[PDB]
Amino acid sequence: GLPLVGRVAAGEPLLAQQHIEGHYQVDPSLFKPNADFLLRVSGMAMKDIGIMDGDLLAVHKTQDVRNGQVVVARIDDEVTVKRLKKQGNKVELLPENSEFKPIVVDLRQQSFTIEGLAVGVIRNGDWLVP
Amino acid sequence: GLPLVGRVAAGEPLLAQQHIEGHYQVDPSLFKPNADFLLRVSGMAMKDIGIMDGDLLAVHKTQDVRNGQVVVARIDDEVTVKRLKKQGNKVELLPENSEFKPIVVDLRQQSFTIEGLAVGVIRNGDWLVP
């Protein structure tokens, strides 16, 4: 099934073997565009739209993303899940939690890559229960 | 796969044929206890824990529920998803949203049934997109 990506080693590609924690069969008709992998979410930055710490984000592999969409982004090795808001050579990664602040990126100054598009969420896949 | 239950007709059993909107293959190792069906969530009463309107709740069929757990309950034909807090002949169904109020049930006065245990959530299964 879909590979589950855990915390990503700095600079290391998302689907690097060390990152995969397992594989889970998920009906492809569930999400659109189709989910290509699952990514465990770190933190509550997107809690207001129901994306909680520990959730498994369903991600479609693409870089064809538009403003307003929730994306998986990599900024200087750090991988994050935020709402995209680009404007010229400036990209804003907005949270959905007032305890967090927007992340502003200067395309000229730092390395920025869209890893994928959030197309769903699966809550569970608990690493504590047998 | 797991059957998806849409809005439930008053007094009608959950898995009544008219309620099923489809079936989705979901890896059984994903949830524990195992998910037996999916239930579309109506409203934002559980938004603070990330259960949003339109989410598909993964439900384990059982009545073996304990205080503190999120359950699917039926009170006088109405089916709801809340956190259980029972005390004698009085059952409190608590929300996770300040815009909502706790639902107090008198076991002697009204019909109350535990339909199942919430074991997960799948967000998507959009009825608008082809």
- Per the entry, the structure determination technique was X-ray
- Is B14 strand, coil or helix? coil
Distance CA B38, CA A44 (A): 25
Distance CA B77, CA B12 (A): 8
Distance CA A55, CA B41 (A): 18
Distance CA A102, CA B122 (A): 27
Residues of B in CB contact (< 8 Å) with A are 1, 24-27, 29-32, 47, 49-52, 55, 58, 119-126, 129-130
Q: Which domains does chain A have, with CATH numbers?
A: 1-130 (2.10.109.10)
The minimum CA-CA distance between A106 and chain B, rounded to whole Å, is 32
Residues of B within 8 A of A128 (CB-CB) are: none
Distance CA B58, CA B24 (A): 11
Helix, strand, coil share of chain A (percent; to 5)? 5, 45, 50
Closest partner residue to A27 among B26, B29, B31, by Cβ?
B26
- Residue B46 contacts residue B97 (beta carbons within 8 Å): yes
Distance CA B54, CA A61 (A): 24
Cis ω before A28 (30° cut-off from 0) = no
State the residue for tokens 């994050």: A80
Residues of A within 8 A of B122 (CB-CB) are: 30, 120-123
Residues of B within 8 A of A49 (CB-CB) are: 52
Closest partner residue to A122 among B29, B30, B51, by Cβ?
B30
Terminal Cα distance for chain A, rounded: 20
**Beta-carbon contacts of residue B16 (< 8 Å; ≥ 6 apart):** B8, B9
